[PDB]
Design a protein that fits this description.
The PDB classes it as transferase/transferase inhibitor. By secondary structure, the chain is an alpha+beta fold. It has two domains: about 80 residues, Phosphorylase Kinase, domain 1 (2-Layer Sandwich); about 170 residues, Transferase(Phosphotransferase), domain 1 (Orthogonal Bundle), CATH 1.10.510.10. Helices cover about 35% and strands about 15% of the residues. The strands form two sheets. A five-stranded antiparallel sheet has the order 1-2-3-5-4, with no helix packed on it. A three-stranded antiparallel sheet has the order 6-7-8. A hairpin with a 5-residue loop joins β7 and β8. Bound molecules: the ligand Nc1ncnc2c1c(-c1ccc(C(=O)Nc3cc(OC(F)(F)F)ccn3)cc1)nn2[C@@H]1CCCN(C(=O)C2CC2)C1.
């Protein structure tokens, strides 16, 4: 299956503390560079996650952080993935790399590709945000932590700033809720890691979201690009474009800038 022998891993350095515990860098079998996530005890519904990991393991796409396996025959649980040299996208954006507007749209395309794949498989992310994206040594952005919020053990919140009205009111997660979050993700990229609704608390942001207050147009984003992210914020979920339409629109803008 997808079980990796924990005795075939080696911890060289600790990259930091992500969601669910610490992340290590090391070698798999003494042959492959990999990152190792140590699921902190008591931070996740492990039984449900272990059984669901089989489905998430089979998801294959270049813009999805490639998963190599897990170590569930022990504790803490291990998750072996590829090593993204540049780490989290949020910290990567807040470090100005002298980002060119063409590069910003490039990052949106990377995420939109992975989301279009998850959409084709009817797999919801539920927590799409710059903090959950990773960048490799070549500057490619890949989506991660997809479908994990459903197993988080809680021991308004912050993710409200990325949620649509139907999620804040009825927790009605769907493909259109990922569309809304992706629109906010585009806002973070063109905002260079700026926090959405930084002036309001979590509860205040939810109130303004329920009232219709959309995120403003970032400075580095043209009206052409802002129209794409703005389309993700239709009040009616059924009126929001799919990731196929979003990816198609992003491709049209990139082709014109060529
Ligand atoms: N791969 C990396 N490479 C370089 N750095 C990496 C990382 C990671 C990472 C490692 C594994 C997963 C992970 O398991 N995703 C998953 C599991 C799933 O479950 C299953 F697998 F399907 F079962 C299902 C879906 N996605 C996520 C992320 N985190 N980090 C850094 C950790 C510390 C903070 N940080 C930063 O950037 C700040 C600036 C210092 C990021």
């Amino acid at each position: 299956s997808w079980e990796i022998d924990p005795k075939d891993l080696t911890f060289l350095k600790e990259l930091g503390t992500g969601q669910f515990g610490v992340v290590k860098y090391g070698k798999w079998r003494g042959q492959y560079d990999v990152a190792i996530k140590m699921i902190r005890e008591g931070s996740m519904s492990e039984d449900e996650f272990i059984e669901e990991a089989k489905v998430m393991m089979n998801l294959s796409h270049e813009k999805l952080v490639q998963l190599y396996g897990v170590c569930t025959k022990q504790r803490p649980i291990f998750i072996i993935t590829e090593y993204m040299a540049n780490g989290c996208l949020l910290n990567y954006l807040r470090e100005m790399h002298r980002f060119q507007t063409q590069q910003l749209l490039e990052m949106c395309k990377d995420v939109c590709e992975a989301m279009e794949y998850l959409e084709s498989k009817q797999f919801l992310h539920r927590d799409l945000a710059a903090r959950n994206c990773l960048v490799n040594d070549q500057g490619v952005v890949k989506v991660s932590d997809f479908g994990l919020s459903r197993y988080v053990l809680d021991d308004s919140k912050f993710p409200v700033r990325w949620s649509p009205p139907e999620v804040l009111m009825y927790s009605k997660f769907s493909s259109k809720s990922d569309i809304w979050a992706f629109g906010v993700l585009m806002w973070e990229i063109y905002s260079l890691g700026k926090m959405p609704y930084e002036r309001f608390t979590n509860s205040e942001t939810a109130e303004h979201i329920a009232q219709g207050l959309r995120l403003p147009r970032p400075h580095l984003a043209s009206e052409r690009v802002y129209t794409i992210m703005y389309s993700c914020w239709h009040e009616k979920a059924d009126e929001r474009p799919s990731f196929k339409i979003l990816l198609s629109n992003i491709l049209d803008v990139m082709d014109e800038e060529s």
